[PDB]
A paper describes a structure:
Lipoteichoic acid (LTA) is an important cell wall component required for proper cell growth in many Gram-positive bacteria. The LTA primase LtaPLm initiates LTA synthesis by transferring the first glycerolphosphate (GroP) subunit onto the glycolipid anchor and the LTA synthase LtaSLm extends the polymer by the repeated addition of GroP subunits to the tip of the growing chain. Regardless of whether LTA synthase or primase, [name]-type enzymes, have the same overall architecture. They are composed of an N-terminal domain with five transmembrane helices, which is followed by an extracellular C-terminal domain (eLtaS) containing the catalytic site (recently reviewed in Ref.
The overall structures of eLtaSLm and eLtaPLm are very similar (root mean square deviation = 1.4 Å for Cα atoms). Both comprise an α/β core and a C-terminal part of four anti-parallel β-strands and a long α-helix. The purified protein was digested with chymotrypsin, and peptide fragments were analyzed by electron spray mass spectrometry. However this modification is likely a mimic of an enzyme-substrate intermediate. In eLtaSLm, this surface groove is constricted by Lys-306, which form a hydrogen bond with Tyr-483.
Residue numbers in the entry: 230 to 644
Write the structure that this text describes.
């Protein structure tokens, strides 16, 4: 109740002077890389790079790239990722939080940044009823929701899950250019979605040769996404948004489940056991902050840490908000990444499937020490306190002093 707030502050990580406020006043552009796993980065299928542009964006001067960034989603899949990004809250242990907690009071990024005059918007090539986004986005405080109704949904431009990504970015330039700055936006892509079907040739790369169809055509839809993103970034550079915004590319969750051990063994080269599968849960995080020296960031982290990381870059102190994540650029950030099912990843030891593993060598640890038991309970506590917020709707009874709550009745996403 006030218990959650006490845990939050004690966990709070002070801003890093080198990165604090360096992007204050800038726009924010989230690029949602659907089902995009980190191992795809710099991966070469039969000689050539699978995702060439993203690989270059990864190496760029002004790009903070994360190699130990893990997704913390559950049965909510993509919805849970949004929950982690917007509120720094975990999803439910079971089922989707978006569907059952659409009535809850939230104090999300749209609301927090809205306090400074930011304009909110979400772009998605599918209808707003999907994942109950239409309802819960109002509680988040998203000013605009550009769903499928704002796009040309002809049969040739539409896959199984909605509008293809290349038309999606192309057609959304109209809306983004006329959106009041400064803004806070997120572009949810669709094409790279299981079982990853692509008809030739939207595709521009040969499929893998493992014998597993869903795994083989994954690399094809990944490049289709890569090509469309490049086209979108090219637009951002022409319109000047590229220098005036913070571009953040991230993955929401895994792309290949653990029911493809044989194929994944050929892909990664090593045996795809339970350990290597947990390591495969890495998803990309690339933060392009204009006029800031970037580089590879190997500190361990999760999606829960994304919002407080962004806030510190924008020069916004979030000490008083109910957020379970910490600033990734902070030196006080502790490298501990909880999974939804109770598991966790630390640089030294990791619990996977309830069993202990050496994170660095992959070899099982027979006996469990105190510190391995201690962090196990720290993780369970964090997950429980997060559920306490969702299950009890605790944000009705709390808010930071200067903060103003959202009136969801004042939002309409229809045209
Ligand atoms: Mg997804």
């Amino acid at each position: 109740v006030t218990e959650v707030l006490n845990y939050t502050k004690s966990k709070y990580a002070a801003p890093n002077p080198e990165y604090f406020g360096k992007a204050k006043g800038k726009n924010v552009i989230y690029i949602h890389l659907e089902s995009f796993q980190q191992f795809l980065v710099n991966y070469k299928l039969n000689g050539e790079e699978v995702t060439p542009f993203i690989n270059s964006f990864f190496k760029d001067q002004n790009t903070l790239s994360f190699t130990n960034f893990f997704h913390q989603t559950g049965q909510g899949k993509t919805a849970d990722s949004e929950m982690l990004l917007e509120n720094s809250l975990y999803g439910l242990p079971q089922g989707s939080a978006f569907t059952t907690k659409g009535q809850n009071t939230y104090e999300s990024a749209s609301a927090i940044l809205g306090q400074q005059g930011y304009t909110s918007a979400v772009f998605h090539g599918n209808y707003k009823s999907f994942w109950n986004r239409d309802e819960i986005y109002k509680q988040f405080g998203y000013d605009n929701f550009f769903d499928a109704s704002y796009y040309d949904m002809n049969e040739a431009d539409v896959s199984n899950y909605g509008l293809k990504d290349k038309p999606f970015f192309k057609e959304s330039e109209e809306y983004l250019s006329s959106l009041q700055q400064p803004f806070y936006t997120k572009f949810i892509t669709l094409t790279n979605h299981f079982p990853y079907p692509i008809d030739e040739k939207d595709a521009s790369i040969a499929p893998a040769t493992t014998g597993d169809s869903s795994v083989d055509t994954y690399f094809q839809t990944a490049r289709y996404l890569d090509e469309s993103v490049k086209s979108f970034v090219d637009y951002l550079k022409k319109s000047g948004l590229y220098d005036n915004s913070v571009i953040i590319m991230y993955g929401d969750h895994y792309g290949i489940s653990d029911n493809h051990e044989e194929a994944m063994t050929k892909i990664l080269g090593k045996d795809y056991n339970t350990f290597e599968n947990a390591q495969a849960q890495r998803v990309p995080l690339m933060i392009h902050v204009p006029g800031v020296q970037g580089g590879v960031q190997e500190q361990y982290g999760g999606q829960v840490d994304l919002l407080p990381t962004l806030l510190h870059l924008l020069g916004v102190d979030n000490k008083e908000y109910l957020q379970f994540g910490t600033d990734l650029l902070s030196k006080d950030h502790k490298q501990l990444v909880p999974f939804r099912n109770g598991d966790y990843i630390t640089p030294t030891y990791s619990m996977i499937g309830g069993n202990m593993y050496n994170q660095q060598t992959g070899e099982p640890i027979a006996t469990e020490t105190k510190e391995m038991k201690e962090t196990k309970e720290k993780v369970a506590k964090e997950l429980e306190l997060s559920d306490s917020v969702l299950q009890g709707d605790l944000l009705r009874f709390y808010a930071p002093d200067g903060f103003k709550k959202v009136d969801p009745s004042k939002y309409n996403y229809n045209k």
